Amino acid sequence: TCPFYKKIPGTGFTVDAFQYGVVEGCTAYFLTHFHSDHYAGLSKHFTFPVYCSEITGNLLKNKLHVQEQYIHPLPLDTECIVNGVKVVLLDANHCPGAVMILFYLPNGTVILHTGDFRADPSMERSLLADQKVHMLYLDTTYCSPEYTFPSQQEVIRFAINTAFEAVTLNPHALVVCGTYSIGKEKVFLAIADVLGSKVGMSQEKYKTLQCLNIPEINSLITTDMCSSLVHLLPMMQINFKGLQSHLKKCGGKYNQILAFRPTGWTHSNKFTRIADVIPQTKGNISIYGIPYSEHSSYLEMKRFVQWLKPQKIIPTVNVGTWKSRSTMEKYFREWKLEAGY
Ligand code: NI
Cα–Cα distance measured from residue 106 to residue 110, given in angstroms and rounded to the nearest whole number: 9
184 CA to centre of ligand 1 in angstroms: 11
* Selection from 147, 181, 144, 98 nearest residue 264 by Cα: 147
Q: Which of 59, 123, 101, 77 is nearest to 296 (CA)?
A: 123
The superfamily (CATH) of domain 1-147+296-341 is Ribonuclease Z/Hydroxyacylglutathione hydrolase-like (3.60.15.10)
Its sign, for the CA torsion 313, 319, 322, 323, is: negative
Q: How far is the CA of 264 from the centre of ligand 1 (A)?
A: 11
How far apart CA 178 and CA 87 sit, in angstroms, is 36
CA of 250 to the centre of ligand 1 (A): 33
Domain range summary for the chain, segments of one domain joined by +: 1-147+296-341, 148-295
Buried b (16+ CB within 10 A) or exposed e, 37-54: ebbeebeeebeebbbbbe
Cα torsion angle, 19, 101, 150, 260, sign:
positive
C-alpha span between 301 and 19 (Å, rounded): 28
Kindly list the protein residues that place their beta carbon closer than 5 angstroms to ligand 1, a single-atom ion: 35, 116
- What's phi and psi for 135, nearest 5 deg? -125, 140
Q: How far is the CA of 138 from the centre of ligand 1 (A)?
A: 13
Closest to 175 (Cα-Cα) out of 223, 246, 241? 246
Phi, psi torsion values for 187, nearest 5 degrees: -55, -60
Please tell me the experimental approach by which this structure was elucidated: X-ray
Chain centroid to Cα 132, Å, comes to 27
What is the Cα–Cα distance from 89 to 113, expressed in whole angstroms? 10
Nearest Cα neighbor of 199 from 157, 169, 230 is 230
Residue 319 burial (CB count, 10 A): 15
- Compute CA 230 distance to the chain's CA centroid, rounded to the nearest angstrom: 22
What residues contact residue 21 under an 8 Å CB cut-off, 6+ apart?
none
d(C-alpha 101, C-alpha 30), whole Å = 9
* Cα 139 to middle of ligand 1, angstroms: 10
Residues 6+ apart with CB under 8 A from 205: 179, 232
As beta bridge partners, residue 13 has 8, 28
**CB neighbour list of residue 173: distance below 8 Å, 6 or more residues apart:** 166, 167, 254, 255, 256, 257, 258
CA 175, 181, 187, 188 dihedral sign is positive
CA of 35 to the centre of ligand 1 (A): 5
Cα(113) to centroid(ligand 1), Å: 14
| Same fold: 1-147+296-341 with 148-295 | no
**Cα–ligand 1 centroid distance for 251 (angstroms):** 37
Residue 7's region, left for phi above 0, alpha for psi from -120 to 50, else beta, is beta
What would be the CATH architecture of the domain defined by 148-295?
Answer: 3-Layer(aba) Sandwich (3.40)
- CA 33 / ligand 1 centre spacing (Å): 7
The residues that bridge with 91 in the sheet, in sequence order, are: 99
CA distance 335 to 340: 8
Sign of the CA dihedral running 192, 213, 50, 68? negative
Cα–ligand 1 centroid distance for 165 (angstroms): 32
CA of 18 to the centre of ligand 1 (A): 15
Helix/strand/coil (H/E/C) assignment for every residue in the chain? CCCHHHEECCCCEEECCCCCCCCCCCCEEECCCCCHHHHCCCCCCCCCCEEECHHHHHHHHHCCCCCHHHEEECCCCCCEEECCEEEEEEECCCCCCCEEEEEECCCCCEEEECCCCCCCHHHHHCHHHHCCCCEEEECCCCCCCCCCCCCHHHHHHHHHHHHHHHHHHCCCEEEEEEECCCCCHHHHHHHHHHHCCCEECCHHHHHHHHCCCCCCHHHCEECCHHHCCEEEEEHHHCCHHHHHHHHHHCCCCCCEEEEEEEECCCHHHCCCCCCCCCCEEECCEEEEEEECCCCCCHHHHHHHHHHHCCCEEEECCCCCCHHHHHHHHHHHHHHHHHHCC
As beta bridge partners, residue 81 has: 86
